[PDB]
Copies of this chain bind each other. A is one copy, B any other.
Amino acid sequence: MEKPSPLLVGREFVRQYYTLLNQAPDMLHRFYGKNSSYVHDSNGKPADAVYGQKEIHRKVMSQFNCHTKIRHVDAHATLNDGVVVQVMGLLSNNNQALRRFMQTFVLAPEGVANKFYVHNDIFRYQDEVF
A-side residues, CB < 8 A to B, are 35, 37, 39, 45-46, 49, 71-72, 74, 76-80, 82, 84, 86, 88, 90, 100, 102-104, 106, 108, 119-120, 122, 124, 126, 129-130
Contacts and interface: CB of A to CB of B under 8 A. Distances in A.
Would you list the 3 A-B pairs with minimal beta carbon distance, nearest first?
A: A102-B102, A79-B80, A86-B104
A97 B7 CA distance: 31
A94 to B, nearest CB: 22
A37 B112 CA distance: 27
7 contacts: A35-B77, A39-B74, A72-B124, A78-B82, A79-B79, A79-B108, A102-B126
B37 A86 contact: no
Contacts of A106: 78-79, 84, 106
A86 B130 contact: no
Contacts of A103: 86
Given A79-B108, A84-B120, 4 more contacts: A49-B74, A74-B124, A76-B120, A106-B106
